[PDB]
Paper text:
In this study, we used a K2 Summit direct detector (Gatan, Inc., Pleasanton, CA) to collect a single particle data set of rotavirus double-layered particle (DLP) and estimate the critical exposure of a non-crystalline specimen. Rotavirus DLP is a spherical particle with a diameter of about 700 Å and a molecular mass of about 70 MDa. The capsid has icosahedral symmetry and consists predominantly of viral proteins VP2 and VP6, forming an inner and outer layer, respectively. VP6 assembles into 260 trimers that arrange in a T = 13 surface lattice containing a total of 780 VP6 monomers.
The T = 13 lattice enables 13-fold averaging of density in addition to the 60-fold icosahedral symmetry. The large size of DLP and its high symmetry make it an ideal specimen for this study, yielding high-contrast particles with very low-alignment errors and almost a thousand averaged subunits per particle. Calculating the Fourier Shell Correlation (FSC) between the VP6 map and the refined atomic model demonstrated a resolution of ∼2.7 Å. One possibility for the difference between this and the ∼2.6 Å obtained with the half map is the absence of full density for the most radiation-sensitive side chains in the map, while they are present in the model. We note also that the density of the α-helix backbone remains visible even after an exposure of ∼50 e−/Å2.
Numbering used by the authors:
A (entry chain A), B (entry chain A), C (entry chain A): 1 to 397
Write the structure that this text describes.
Amino acid sequence: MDVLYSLSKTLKDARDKIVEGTLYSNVSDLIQQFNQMIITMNGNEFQTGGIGNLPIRNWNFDFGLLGTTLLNLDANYVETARNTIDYFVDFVDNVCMDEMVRESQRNGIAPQSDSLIKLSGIKFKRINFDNSSEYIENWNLQNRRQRTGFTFHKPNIFPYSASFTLNRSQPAHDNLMGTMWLNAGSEIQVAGFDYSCAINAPANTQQFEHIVQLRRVLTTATITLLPDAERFSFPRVITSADGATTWYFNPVILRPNNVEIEFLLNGQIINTYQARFGTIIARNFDTIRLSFQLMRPPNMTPAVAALFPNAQPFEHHATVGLTLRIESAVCESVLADASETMLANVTSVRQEYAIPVGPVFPPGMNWTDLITNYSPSREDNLQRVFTVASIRSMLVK
Amino acid sequence: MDVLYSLSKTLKDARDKIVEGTLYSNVSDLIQQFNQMIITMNGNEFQTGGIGNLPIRNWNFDFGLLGTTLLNLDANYVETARNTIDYFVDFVDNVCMDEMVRESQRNGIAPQSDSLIKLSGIKFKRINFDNSSEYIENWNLQNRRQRTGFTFHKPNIFPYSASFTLNRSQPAHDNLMGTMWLNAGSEIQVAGFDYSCAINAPANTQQFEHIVQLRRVLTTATITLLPDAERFSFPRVITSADGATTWYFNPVILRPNNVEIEFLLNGQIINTYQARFGTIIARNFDTIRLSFQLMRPPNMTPAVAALFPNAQPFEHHATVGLTLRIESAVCESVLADASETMLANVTSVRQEYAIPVGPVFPPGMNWTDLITNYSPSREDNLQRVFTVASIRSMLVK
Amino acid sequence: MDVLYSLSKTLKDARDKIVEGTLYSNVSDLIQQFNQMIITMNGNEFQTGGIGNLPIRNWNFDFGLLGTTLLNLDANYVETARNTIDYFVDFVDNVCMDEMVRESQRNGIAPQSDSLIKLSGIKFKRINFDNSSEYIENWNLQNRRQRTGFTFHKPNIFPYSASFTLNRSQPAHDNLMGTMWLNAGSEIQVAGFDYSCAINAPANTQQFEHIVQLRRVLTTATITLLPDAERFSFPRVITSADGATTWYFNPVILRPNNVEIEFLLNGQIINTYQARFGTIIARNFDTIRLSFQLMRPPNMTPAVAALFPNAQPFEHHATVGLTLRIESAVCESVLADASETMLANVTSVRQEYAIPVGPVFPPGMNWTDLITNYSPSREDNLQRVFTVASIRSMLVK
Ligand SMILES: [Ca+2]
Ligand SMILES: [Ca+2]
Ligand SMILES: [Ca+2]
Ligand SMILES: [Ca+2]
Ligand SMILES: [Cl-]
Ligand SMILES: [Zn+2]
């Protein structure tokens, strides 16, 4: 993997650096590395493709070195360099694509592709240079078994699920207290509702909890908590848990009470925030538990009093909601995120060449399926593909 | 354009690299390039400005080289270097600003500015070095007619439009089925509504479609699909298509049914997703067609049954909605996006110097106007300004 | 601060660059800098920690140089290098953490930590190299008193506040016109409501204003304006300004009228946008004033007419709303933002070692408290911690 990165990294620098009219000193070190790459590559045959719709290509390297005598580079020098760069960029691109579409249950980390396997051989190690990328650096650390972290803006950590639970239920479905939620992407929305409005409830208060457990630990996250949920604040007709019938939800929205958010790792509270809205920091967590309460208003003006009356039927149902978004976090595992293009790159290559379903990855490379049962085997496989995708993007965007 | 980039790129590196107490070896290659820039620049006169409120400046270069003999740099060396760097940073800044405010219908790609025209002359080519930026690299590829892509987080691709269509209409405006939408930025929201609730409708089902066509093709995009639209879920009084009268919309929200999203390029479906929510990938597309259906509930509890009754008047109107956001994509054309600062930079310079309206660009450099009729002429002009803006930001943020 | 940056910067490059099998030419300049760092460091003792729960560590440097004779690096060379790199990475990490947790009212900019104070001494200046980071570059400019800017995606500029004002009020709280808002993060939402619907109002029109004043000036921002506010579009029971009673808000939503947004700096309008939605640019501002009007519909279909009737009670209350998000801006002061991880890093270190409350910073390092009274003293302190946090992230993520 490291060797493949360097081939790309060199080719990229060669493209940026070798420009007509530039001083030789600017590119002298680069010319040496580029040449060393040609010497190592030369005389080897590489075969890629033949899986799915991906064509089989044979790659042959027999190139001359670049000159080291000009003071400033010229159009001639640049043209010669380009021909070598082009053939090389194409090979790397293909080697990457071939890697991207494979997976192994037993040894996910090891390179699947024949071309990648050949490179990881001893002779080629010379090509290796300058592994400064966030993905390569992380790749290097993992082999040494050191700590690593990827930084995500809007981490994609919550598999999509929308649901509700009815804490008190009737067939009439006319006097219900339950929470409903959406967890999608980096955003959690939780709503607690009482049809009664807690007129019965001891202390006149109703207590709701949502607990969300993440697949992977997150560190140094930045999050926003907002009182209320926009999503669950409008009237809906809702299909039913059994699936038999449909209830009706009509809400009136009251400020949540006695809110707490707890961020827990192994069930020790690490961070706890009470009645705090806006940006908050959770340093380390694997679970979030949100607690909020519905409190009946002790004093009501006349219009309010009409809304909540002492016995059914109740027209308007009291709801309290929270919204939590993780803006950025750090993970020790790769995840899809808003900014990065890796899931998109891997998914697209697989889609285009009609790769058949593979044991390691859910069909279509669906994120929700993948994040839902994100096993160690999947994690190994995901990183190897992601790194190659990153490598590929250096050259082919 | 390439020469201008290097002037900037050198000046930037000179600022980062030439610091007091540093080893000469660290900056030796840089000193050579910096000096070469001084030799090339020296003896030339450049004139900029005089368009709008932008002042006319005359630029004269007569500077000595930097020394190459110290072991570690010192306060003296740094002070001398700074004076040259300052004059140079100012010139570049101005040359850029002068470029930013001009445009041509006939030859948008070619540099408009007198200063930029002079630089693109043969002698100056020597200054050229190290074109590694995403904007410069893309600039280089386009001249060679190779494939290019810019990567956007939250691409700004949908011109702002909010509208509705009434599929069934009455002057009473009391029994209406129609879709309403918002397309803004990277976000599409579509809502389908039936006042009847489809009690009449064949199969008890009502089918809605929204088709959105983008101005430019997008590749390897990451998108979120969420059932329901928050925007169209609350009651509104709406002005009317003729503009004569106003209707009333009151919605009750039901899960959309038989949802499909299709991503099409030249009217071949490239990607199709059915009943899938959360993150999905569209590898290549120029059109999105969203299809969803409204299905009357076969079974209704008593409160639900009250909501939809067999003949008018109907108090509550059934609605089904979708939300689609493109988190990140790749385009072969420049676009405004959430992260980048180029539209802001170009627009601000034009605003500040009171540049008169130009044929190529809509007045005020408005994005919606620009994206709405994003012609080849505009695209050429947009990139040249954007690259200069990027160049300028290296030095002047 | 500059010296600390370089120690880190060197160590980072040493980790990326010194890899087995690489050509010596690739790392020769680096080896020279790395060695120079060892020579400067050697023979000095540094003590860190002892504040809060942070352990006291003693640091001793006595290391040999790296060899300069191999053609390509080998496993041996790499292993030797790593041992030096490790001890060094640990020290830097600790020096940073020690810096992060301190603050001074009197001299915020100067380094608080004993280790940092020792480094800023004359002998160590030699280590200094290559200050190219956005944070370090900004640090350098500020000392020279030059202009600086940080670029934020989703700047965190509005302290969280949710409120309302009642322009016309009754104890009944049954005929009210008032605005309500949320300002959180980079997002401003404003809603104007009339229970009457302006049937009384002169010209049949009702005019609302929201004025928001930011703590720091912002330049070249990109913003989205959307008609309507999702947040205030659903019915709520609201506690009351006195806190005594609760009113009831039920809204019907009408398009805002005669919208203007003004961006002002020192109370001169810099940018003014009328009836413009979608992306707009504000080049320079310290205040936003949003103006919108509620206009009674001259023509109403029968269902609409029912909604607004001539005398109380009024069931449905007319509302008009605006949403404004700043996607990206530039500030001359550091701010928390969606992408960056600095507030999270500083906050987490303080949380973990149980640092006692400090005079400069609000307890818990809360952003809303900090942004609300963002004094010059806080700003000085915030930057020094932020730069160290950035430095630390180079090495320890
Ligand atoms: Ca765990
Ligand atoms: Ca309602
Ligand atoms: Ca097309
Ligand atoms: Ca000011
Ligand atoms: Cl975002
Ligand atoms: Zn973002």
